[PDB]
């Protein structure tokens with residue numbers, strides 16, 4: 001006869017989206033345990049008990065007999081509270097129940113990368129569950145139980161320490177936008193036969209991450225055949241060369257230098273530029289000269305390179321650093337990369353050119369979206385947040401309002417002008433942005449791959465008062481082309497349309513507005 005201590009499970013904190021939609025919830029479950037010593041005196045009830053647990057008669061009997069000398073075994077864990085009381089209703093001697101919790105993720109794969117999961121011991125091992133584990137964790141309680149000589153429980157004596165629940169956490173994510181983004185990125189991956197991808201949506205005024213989705217993904221509620229590669233929150237932890245998607249920042253440096261103005265014309269013939277042993281090449285070569293806007297519309301590597309030689313790498317480096325490329329986001333998401341903005345003491349022409357058109361630096365999709373947000377928010381950068389923001393934070397003017405306005409207009413033309421990225425047009429709205437395509441880095445050697453690509457699009461909308469910024473990255477498309485303006489642009493179009501509608505943003509381009517918007 002003796003008193004034993006028994007744990008009282010604590011409620012882990014609720015994780016919700018920005019509007020209270022549950023993303024991670026501790027749900028009540030019932031574990032059944034048995035005192036084999038008591039069960040051994042009621043052998044005649046076993047077949048009935050075994051059947052009610054869906055276990056084979058002899059296998060169940062073997063279990064109990066092999067543990068006859070023990071005072072405690074688990075019969076089954078994670079029953080619904082109703083099923084547990086169904087078994088306890090049979091009043092089999094030696095069978096007891098205890099209330100426990102199971103962590104459940106109602107959106108499953110849709111937000112697996114951001115939210116993460118807890119392991120068997122209720123510790124966060126990935127994502128937000130890891131990052132806020134101390135905040136979310138409850139502290140389990142304790143109570144005393146009196147047992148007789150045969151381990152039979154005859155009295156609950158007292159609670160020695162109450163359980164304390166963890167705290168609720170509201171993420172910045174809008175689950176509605178997350179569902180839309182998840183579905184459209186998945187469709188694009190499959191249509192394009194791509195290996196992976198990411199999509200980020202950002203509130204340009206508040207810095208809040210409204211959506212963050214990647215492929216491949218996984219179901220955190222059933223991780224039985226989970227492979228490591230599918231667990232990666234690529235938007236935060238994978239870096240890439242952004243290519244021509246950083247040209248707007250090179251252009252901002254030019255415009256801020258005092259040496260360039262939008263009407264200036266750059267000679268780009270014949271669409272290549274030799275600098276020692278290296279050859280800078282333009283993909284499209286149907287122009288001998290281009291104005292500043294045309295350098296972006298036609299995405300001229302040669303054009304931006306000549307501008308970079310004139311203004312110097314330092315001015316470009318400086319803009320990129322200020323908008324957050326290669327810089328710590330301050331988010332503290334587990335595994336998150338800072339990336340790399342190269343800094344030489346002396347900048348050769350080669351490095352100066354490649355920086356300006358987006359190679360030799362590494363960024364994340366989150367950083368790229370953050371930099372576009374600053375541009376969209378009339379040159380004012382606000383800190384990123386993955387938790388709900390109540391008050392608009394004070395921003396930092398990283399690009400002048402005048403320059404940001406001029407670059408916004410250029411990027412609107414990149415989407416809307418003839419020869420532009422027309423697949424990025426958003427019905428009902430004026431949108432602005434820049435596509436990109438990058439050759440992937442060679443496996444097993446230095447240099448770039450001949451037939452493997454990363455497709456990019458980054459932009460914001462609506463042009464008249466930007467509300468959200470979005471980055472789409474698709475890795476190794478193989479079925480319907482590879483250029484960013486063919487692959488990632490239409491994903492931007494569809495997701496931006498949906499997002500703006502879901503957030504009730506009024507259409508600013510009614511000529512192209514669909515029937516449903518022309519009435520509201």
Ligand SMILES: CCN1CCN(C(=O)N[C@@H](C(=O)N[C@H](C(=O)O)[C@H]2N[C@@H](C(=O)O)C(C)(C)S2)c2ccccc2)C(=O)C1=O
Nearest residue numbers: 243244283299354359435436437438439448483484485486
């Ligand atoms: C540092 C050396 N090094 C590294 C590798 N490297 C590139 O991988 N270059 C890219 C490139 O130039 N892509 C263009 C861009 O984004 O501007 C295209 N993207 C299209 C689109 O987004 O639809 C477009 C607007 C129609 S043009 C390329 C070239 C050829 C085929 C695919 C991709 C360089 O250039 C380069 O010198």
Ligand SMILES: [Cl-]
Nearest residue numbers: 442443444445
């Ligand atoms: Cl490699």
Ligand SMILES: [Cl-]
Nearest residue numbers: 449450451452
């Ligand atoms: Cl290849």
